[PDB]
C-alpha cells in the first residue's frame, strides 16, 4: 500500500477524503525513453514540403561545346533578351535547378513500438508527481498545497471561464498562470510570417474523467490544456522531451487512473499490458552505499585527495639534509673525514 493523496476543494481547502496512489507514479522515470519516443512522436504531426518538379527544367539551354574559350555550362539560346548566352541546368547557376530537389516521399512520420510509446507516457505521468522535477521543468509550483495535486470532481461542472480560473487561483496555480501571459513573445525567425507568430510558456494540464463544461471553460485561459485520462498525450505530458508537467488532477480522474493503467490488485484495461518493472529496487544509490550493510564489508577509507609523496627532486651530494635521510652513515663519514684518510 501507498502513502495516500488528499483531495482539495474549489476554495483550496483540504477535504477529509483521501485517495490511494494509482501505482503509475511508481513507474520507472526514464528520461532516455521519453526523449527517444518524443522525438519520433513530434515528427508525426508534420506535413510534406517539396520544390516543384518543373522548376529549373523550364528552360531550353544547350552546351556550347569544346574549345570555345568559355566555361562548358549549358547556356540558354535565343538572342537580344539578356537571358541569352547565360547558364542554366546547374546547382551553381542563377535560376538553375537546386541540388537534390526535395521530394514529397521523404520519411515524414515515424513508426514507434506501441509498448515503448506506452512506457514513455507512464514515465511522463510518474514525473508529474515528484515536485522537484516539476520545479526544474519550469512551472511556479511553490505555493501549491500538495503534489500530485488533486481537486474535487465539481471542477468539471464549471461552465464559465471566470469561475474556472478562480478555482485554479484558489488552489495555487496563480503563479503558473502569470508565468504564461507574461511570456508572450514574437517568434524569433521566419516563423512570424508562416502562422507561428506568437510563442508562450506551457501552463498546467487539467485532467478530467468526463467533461461537464471544463474543456470549454479552460480553452481560453492561455497555457491551460485539458486531457481526458483515457488519452493522456505524451506531447502534452512531456513538452520538448522534458519530464514533469504540472498536472492538476480531478478526483474522478485520479481514481480512474488505477483502471486505465493498472496496479497489483486491479487488472489493466489495456489488452495484455502491464506497467514496467524497475531494474533496481531503489531509485537512489546512496542508501545502498551508505548502509549499515555495505560499509561493514568494506576496507578503510582514503583522504579523497592524496598527500603528495615526493613533489620535487631534492638532490643529495648537495643539500646536506637529504643526504642524511639516504645513508645515515654519512654523519660518521663526515666526523672521521674518511675520504681524507692516512695509510
Amino acid at each position: 500500500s501507498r502513502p495516500q493523496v488528499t483531495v482539495h476543494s474549489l476554495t483550496g481547502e483540504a477535504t477529509a477524503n483521501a485517495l490511494p496512489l494509482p501505482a503509475v507514479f511508481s513507474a520507472p522515470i526514464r528520461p532516455d525513453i521519453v526523449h527517444t519516443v518524443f522525438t519520433s512522436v513530434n515528427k508525426n504531426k508534420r506535413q510534406a514540403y517539396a520544390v516543384s518538379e518543373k522548376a529549373g527544367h523550364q528552360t531550353s539551354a544547350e552546351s556550347w561545346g569544346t574549345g570555345r574559350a568559355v566555361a562548358r555550362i549549358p547556356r540558354v539560346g535565343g538572342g537580344g533578351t539578356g537571358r541569352s548566352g547565360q547558364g542554366a541546368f546547374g546547382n551553381m547557376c542563377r535560376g538553375g535547378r537546386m541540388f537534390a530537389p526535395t521530394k514529397t516521399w521523404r520519411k515524414w512520420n515515424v513508426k514507434v513500438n506501441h509498448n515503448e510509446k506506452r512506457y514513455a507516457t507512464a514515465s511522463a505521468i510518474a514525473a508529474t508527481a515528484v515536485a522537484s522535477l516539476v520545479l526544474a521543468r519550469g512551472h511556479r509550483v511553490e505555493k501549491i498545497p500538495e503534489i500530485p495535486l488533486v481537486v474535487s470532481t465539481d471542477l468539471e461542472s464549471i461552465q464559465k471561464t471566470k469561475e474556472a480560473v478562480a478555482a485554479l487561483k484558489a488552489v495555487g496555480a496563480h503563479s503558473d498562470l502569470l508565468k504564461v501571459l507574461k511570456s508572450k513573445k514574437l517568434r524569433a525567425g521566419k516563423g512570424k510570417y508562416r502562422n507561428r507568430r506568437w510563442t508562450q510558456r506551457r501552463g498546467p494540464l487539467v485532467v478530467y474523467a468526463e467533461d461537464n463544461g471544463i474543456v470549454k471553460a479552460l480553452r481560453n485561459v492561455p497555457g491551460v490544456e485539458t486531457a481526458n485520462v483515457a488519452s493522456l498525450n505524451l506531447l502534452q505530458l512531456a513538452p520538448g522531451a522534458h519530464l514533469g508537467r504540472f498536472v492538476i488532477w480531478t478526483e474522478a480522474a485520479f481514481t480512474k487512473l488505477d483502471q486505465v493503467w493498472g496496479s497489483e490488485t486491479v487488472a489493466s484495461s489495456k489488452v495484455g499490458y502491464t506497467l514496467p518493472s524497475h531494474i533496481i529496487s531503489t531509485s537512489d544509490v546512496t542508501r545502498i552505499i551508505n548502509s549499515s550493510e555495505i560499509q561493514s564489508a568494506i576496507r578503510p577509507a582514503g583522504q579523497a585527495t592524496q598527500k603528495r609523496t615526493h613533489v620535487l627532486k631534492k638532490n643529495p651530494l648537495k643539500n646536506k639534509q637529504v643526504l642524511l635521510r639516504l645513508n645515515p652513515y654519512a654523519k660518521v663519514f663526515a666526523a672521521e673525514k674518511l675520504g681524507s684518510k692516512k695509510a
Binding site: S1, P3, Q4, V5, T6, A14, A18, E146, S281, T282, D284, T286, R287, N290, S291, S292, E293, S296, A297
Partner: protein, 220 residues
C-alpha cells in the same frame, strides 16, 4: 480504519489517531486474533513516523511508539506461572508484525529518514525487552518470545531479512539492555542465538565477523 488515519497527510488527525489507538489498545476485548490486522497497524504506525520530520517531535513520537508496547498489555495483571493469559498471548502478535514491517521496509527507506528508524527500532527493542514483563523473567514468555524473535529477525540462515538490521540490533541491545538497570537475566540464551549465527555457515562474512567482533568483544 486506522491505516487511513495513521497514514494521513494531516498532523492533527494523526495525533488524534494515535490517541484513538491508545483507547483502541486499552480496549483489549477486540484485539484477539488476526495477525495481519497487527501488520496493518504497524504499517500505519510506520507511516505515522514517516510524516514526522522535526527532531524533538520525532523523538517524542518514537518514545510514545515504544510506549505503545506499554499501554497495550501493561504489567499490572502480572501473571503467576500462567502461560499466556490475555497479556502475553496476543502481545507477541503485536511484536512480530513490527519486525515484519521492518523486514519489508529496509530497501525503501532513504538516506535522510533512516535515523528515525534506527532510533525507532532502538526504542521499540527497548520497549518489547522492557515487556518481557515488569520483571525480566517469565520463562515460557522467554522461550516463546525468543522463538518469535529468533524465527524472524536474527534468522541469519535466510537472506530474506536485510543484513543491516541484525548488525544494528547488535549495536543497540547492550546499552539498551542495561537501560533496564550487574544482574542475571535470560541474556545468555539471547547471546546463544548469536553463537548459533557463528555456528551457522552458508552465510555472509558480515554477520559472521561483525557479531563475532562487535558482540563478543564486549567486556560487559
Amino acid at each position: 480504519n486506522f491505516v487511513k488515519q495513521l497514514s494521513s497527510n494531516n498532523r492533527k488527525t494523526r495525533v488524534n489517531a494515535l490517541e484513538a489507538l491508545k483507547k483502541y489498545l486499552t480496549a483489549k476485548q477486540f484485539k484477539e486474533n488476526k495477525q495481519i490486522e497487527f501488520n496493518k497497524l504497524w504499517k500505519g504506525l510506520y507511516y505515522a513516523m514517516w510524516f514526522s520530520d522535526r527532531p524533538r517531535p520525532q523523538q517524542r513520537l518514537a518514545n510514545e511508539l515504544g510506549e505503545l508496547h506499554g499501554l497495550y498489555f501493561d504489567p499490572k495483571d502480572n501473571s503467576t506461572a500462567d502461560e499466556l493469559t490475555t497479556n502475553d498471548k496476543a502481545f507477541i502478535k503485536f511484536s512480530r508484525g513490527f519486525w515484519k514491517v521492518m523486514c519489508f521496509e529496509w530497501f525503501n527507506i532513504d538516506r535522510y529518514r533512516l535515523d528515525k528508524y534506527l532510533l525507532l527500532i532502538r526504542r521499540v527493542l527497548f520497549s518489547q525487552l522492557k515487556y518481557l514483563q515488569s520483571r525480566n523473567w517469565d520463562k515460557k514468555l522467554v522461550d516463546e518470545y525468543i522463538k518469535k524473535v529468533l524465527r524472524w529477525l536474527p534468522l541469519s540462515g535466510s537472506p530474506k531479512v536485510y543484513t543491516g538490521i541484525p548488525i544494528h540490533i547488535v549495536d543497540i541491545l547492550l546499552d539498551e539492555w542495561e537501560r533496564l538497570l550487574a544482574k542475571k537475566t535470560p541474556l545468555a540464551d539471547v547471546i546463544a542465538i548469536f553463537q548459533d549465527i557463528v555456528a551457522d555457515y552458508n552465510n555472509s562474512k558480515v554477520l559472521r565477523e561483525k557479531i563475532k567482533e562487535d558482540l563478543f568483544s564486549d567486556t560487559r
